[PDB]
Write an enzyme that holds these catalytic residues in place. Structure first.
Site, PDB file in Angstrom:
ATOM      1  CD1 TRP A 152      -2.683   1.580   0.682  1.00  0.00           C
ATOM      2  CD2 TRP A 152      -2.031   1.829   2.732  1.00  0.00           C
ATOM      3  NE1 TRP A 152      -3.408   2.826   1.263  1.00  0.00           N
ATOM      4  CE2 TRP A 152      -3.028   2.767   2.438  1.00  0.00           C
ATOM      5  CE3 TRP A 152      -1.486   1.554   4.073  1.00  0.00           C
ATOM      6  CZ2 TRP A 152      -3.374   3.448   3.574  1.00  0.00           C
ATOM      7  CZ3 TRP A 152      -2.017   2.623   4.791  1.00  0.00           C
ATOM      8  CH2 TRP A 152      -2.982   3.476   4.702  1.00  0.00           C
TER       9      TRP A 152
ATOM     10  CE  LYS B  45     -10.034  -0.885   3.399  1.00  0.00           C
ATOM     11  NZ  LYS B  45     -10.070   0.052   2.359  1.00  0.00           N
TER      12      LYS B  45
ATOM     13  CG  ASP C 165      -1.091  -2.812   7.318  1.00  0.00           C
ATOM     14  OD1 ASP C 165      -2.461  -3.136   7.909  1.00  0.00           O
ATOM     15  OD2 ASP C 165      -0.793  -1.905   6.858  1.00  0.00           O
TER      16      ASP C 165
HETATM   17  C1  LIG Z   1      -2.901  -2.783   3.446  1.00  0.00           C
HETATM   18  C2  LIG Z   1      -3.763  -1.672   4.258  1.00  0.00           C
HETATM   19  N1  LIG Z   1      -3.151  -1.166   5.446  1.00  0.00           N
HETATM   20  C3  LIG Z   1      -3.745  -0.078   6.042  1.00  0.00           C
HETATM   21  C4  LIG Z   1      -4.637   0.353   5.671  1.00  0.00           C
HETATM   22  C5  LIG Z   1      -5.548   1.368   6.667  1.00  0.00           C
HETATM   23  O1  LIG Z   1      -7.022   1.580   6.402  1.00  0.00           O
HETATM   24  P1  LIG Z   1      -7.696   2.396   7.589  1.00  0.00           P
HETATM   25  O2  LIG Z   1      -7.067   3.456   8.168  1.00  0.00           O
HETATM   26  O3  LIG Z   1      -8.870   2.801   6.505  1.00  0.00           O
HETATM   27  O4  LIG Z   1      -8.216   1.499   8.441  1.00  0.00           O
HETATM   28  C6  LIG Z   1      -5.399   0.095   4.313  1.00  0.00           C
HETATM   29  C7  LIG Z   1      -6.089   1.033   3.711  1.00  0.00           C
HETATM   30  N2  LIG Z   1      -6.944  -0.007   3.080  1.00  0.00           N
HETATM   31  C8  LIG Z   1      -4.597  -1.008   3.660  1.00  0.00           C
HETATM   32  O5  LIG Z   1      -5.038  -1.379   2.572  1.00  0.00           O
END
Ligand SMILES: Cc1ncc(COP(=O)(O)O)c(CN)c1O
Ligand SMILES: Cc1ncc(COP(=O)(O)O)c(CN)c1O
Lengths: 396, 396
Positions: B130, B246, B211
């Protein structure tokens, strides 16, 4: 690896929380809170916000991400509240607002923005000021210097010392101002002092940074903004960090805004894109709930009418307690002059108690307060006013 | 002053948003979204969360601040989901969870914690990964190096290249791993590869950083955690950043958690106090709404039963589209082998399209996708599958 990691110190106010919620003598009064409490010692969720929330529950169709700067209605609503409805800054489109997680988040994003995109190095914070201010700017890598402010003798704003310490700051330095309801003193400049300050700020070339977390708690919504508006009419650039935590009772929803002002729409859009970059690298996009609530309230004038009333009721309660505190003290009997309390605005004021006194207060009476002698007036109910004043009088 | 301020670049995915919401040819399909969409191309708010929200609307009595680490029920619920219900890490109390504004906020706070309290300097991010990952760690002042990962030829995880590039990292370096559903490739290590990785991670002395933003989207809730659990059973320390954006459809409420694991309860509490210091200097305390919703859902087993079903329905829809994408392509006719698509997990995968191709896709057909050829499978409905496959086939 974490084994040789230094334990973080005790947050000045958090230690109190625990000691309070331990004191087995229930006659106890916690005055080092920071949150507003009604006559029942309860921090309720405003009726306007509850109505607002039912509305959202009924109408929301998705939880998809907001833009880095949040809900736009929220943005225009905040700058209107801040600068006025016909403000040139709005008409010329030289202000941009990013919705942020509380007023603290607005201060951190400003800090990061300033630290990465400009050459500001020092930030001038008043002495005293909210303690988390130093930590915020420090974490961004900025250094914090302090200008004088509180006249401990006359319990007042030492203007002379004030302007005299700011002369130490170079053009390019960021000077942090409290919009209204100075934390922790409750002393705010008069409109004339604000103006000399605005005038001097232009001549010395500071970048004003307004911490506006108590709009509506001193005189009213518009009145409280007159200081910042004095600066905004005189400066081409300024940053304002505002919080909706207190005045909407939305503490835990984290709702605030970081507003940027620049000479023109072109420059503000260019600097704002970088502020948005700072947000993306921090938390990505802001929390929609608390901001949605503020956006719908402020835009439905039936709801905005109810909220305003709830705020003037909050403001007036505080003013009745500052007033009733002064004379209940004069009935319990002590060599004093606590009338300075009546002159101060907002939930706070320095009682003028020594750390020795504030200590025996907690210890021998169960009256809790922050070491600095700062006392949250909203923690006083017409009921607990008597024992409070007795204890205070018994340690003077 | 801001006049000589550099405009921030165009975020890789945000440019697409605008170009899409401009394309006057409504047969257009946006595949560079990142959010989940149902068969109607709508990102709905889950039934479980709506029920949860009515419950909160009925029962909340205050909006007073949460603690720096958020709602505790939320914390235990997240570590149970992450490590398992009887995990030793939980029983020995060597894990601590801070509720944060989304998974990104969890990554930033980890970054700040690591940057101020340890001597970690570099963070190893997969290539690709990402894009906001680099910016997050960079803003904390950490440098980002990359280890190999994607075999562009066989559309696979080049393990050999992978382990071979990690040998470049010193003991003390933080190595970033995607828990499941690798963004942007959808390629995840097999359990055996995870284990060799866990084993090698211990011998080389890395600090694993997981992550975990897609728990439940690859195989199931427990299955998806088996990789991190392989590491957590072998390491004395690790950090995991998780997101509920998600899997609960809570995108804009900003709900995630930063979990710390240390050798013992004593050390974890000492390091955690500093992580809390980092939070206080960032946004003070987390947004209660989205987290309250997750806390009540996961703890009311009637509500948790409904949520789980909603998640398996989401997961299965995605799996049906990866499946239906492969053969609709083989019906539109082209020299290919897109079966690799079926092997991948989650909402994403690299279609294998060149930037030239992805370009003529947008231009000549209105099919939008990110330059890397990354395609969000959740953007495909059984209806738009035909024109999508026609266009793709017409540019190969
Ligand atoms: C792999 C990954 N890590 C971290 C994030 C963090 O997302 P959020 O702040 O919306 O939880 C995302 C965003 N989709 C992601 O795709
Ligand atoms: C003067 C001042 N500035 C900024 C803040 C920010 O508060 P919040 O994050 O809760 O809006 C506070 C906290 N009360 C404050 O007292």
């Amino acid at each position: 690896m974490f084994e040789n990691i230094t334990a973080a110190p005790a947050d000045p106010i958090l230690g109190l929380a625990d000691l309070f919620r331990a004191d087995e003598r229930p006659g106890k009064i916690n005055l080092g809170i920071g949150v507003y409490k009604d006559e029942t010692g309860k921090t309720p969720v405003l009726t306007s916000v509850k109505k607002a929330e039912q509305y959202l529950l009924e109408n929301e169709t998705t939880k998809n991400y907001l833009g880095i700067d949040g809900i736009p209605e929220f943005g225009r609503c905040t700058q209107e509240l801040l600068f006025g409805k016909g403000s040139a800054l709005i008409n010329d489109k030289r202000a941009r607002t990013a919705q942020t997680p509380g007023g603290t988040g607005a201060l951190r994003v400003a800090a990061d923005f300033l630290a990465k995109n400009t050459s500001v190095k020092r930030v001038w914070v008043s002495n005293p000021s909210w303690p988390n201010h130093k930590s915020v700017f420090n974490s961004a890598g900025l250094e914090v210097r302090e200008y004088a402010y509180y006249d401990a003798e006359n319990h007042t704003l030492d203007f002379d010392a004030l302007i005299n310490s700011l002369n130490e700051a170079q053009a390019g330095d960021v000077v942090l101002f409290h919009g209204c309801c100075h934390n922790p003193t409750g002393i705010d400049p008069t409109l004339e002092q604000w103006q000399t300050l605005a005038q001097l700020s232009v001549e010395k070339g500071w970048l004003p940074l307004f911490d506006f977390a108590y709009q509506g708690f001193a005189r009213g919504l518009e009145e409280d903004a007159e200081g910042l508006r004095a600066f905004a009419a005189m400066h081409k650039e300024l940053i304002v960090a505002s919080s909706y935590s207190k005045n909407f009772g939305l503490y835990n929803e984290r709702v605030g805004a970081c507003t940027l002002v620049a000479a023109d729409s072109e420059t503000v859009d260019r600097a704002f894109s970088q502020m948005k970059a700072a947000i993306r690298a921090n938390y990505s996009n802001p929390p929609a709930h608390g901001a949605s609530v503020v956006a719908t309230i402020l835009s439905n004038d039936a709801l905005r009418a109810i909220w305003e009333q709830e705020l003037t009721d909050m403001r007036q309660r505080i003013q009745r307690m500052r007033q009733l505190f002064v004379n209940t003290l004069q009935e319990k009997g002590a060599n004093r002059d606590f009338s300075f309390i009546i002159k101060q605005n907002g939930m706070f004021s320095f009682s003028g108690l020594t750390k020795e006194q504030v200590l025996r207060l907690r210890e021998e009476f169960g009256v809790y307060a922050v070491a600095s002698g700062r006392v949250n007036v909203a923690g006083m109910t017409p009921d607990n006013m008597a024992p409070l004043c007795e204890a205070i009088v018994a340690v003077l």
